[PDB]
């Protein structure tokens, strides 16, 4: 029933050390909560500050100020559209040069 989300990074997926990046989860219309997952069991963020990016879809945006090389690696999206969660988006790999 409901489409799997999409994940992207801004400006890109390759970001120098200390710089900023912004993950952009999107799925359809009528999403209540977006969750950005890094290791989905322990570390993740939930937002209700959902924006609309098209007649067809909506998007939430999460941002880290000073990116550590710790912050490199995988990330995925999920959205909760009551009463159920979406399947899990495809992996985004953030790359950070030493």
């Amino acid at each position: 029933d409901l489409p799997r989300p999409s994940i992207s990074a801004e400006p890109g997926t390759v970001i120098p050390l200390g710089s900023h990046v912004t993950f952009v989860c999107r799925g359809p219309v009528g999403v209540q909560t977006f969750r950005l997952e890094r290791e989905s069991r322990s570390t993740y963020n939930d937002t209700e500050d959902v924006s609309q990016a098209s007649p067809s879809e909506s998007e939430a945006r999460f941002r880290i100020d000073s990116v550590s090389e710790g912050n490199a690696g995988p990330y995925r999206c999920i959205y909760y559209k009551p009463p159920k969660w979406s399947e899990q988006s495809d992996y985004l790999e953030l790359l950070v040069k030493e």
């Binding site: 963020n45 999460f62 912050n71």
Partner: peptide
């Protein structure tokens, strides 16, 4: 969200 977020926590 502050202490267990996707930034690392």
């Amino acid at each position: 969200g502050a202490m267990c977020g996707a930034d690392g926590g």
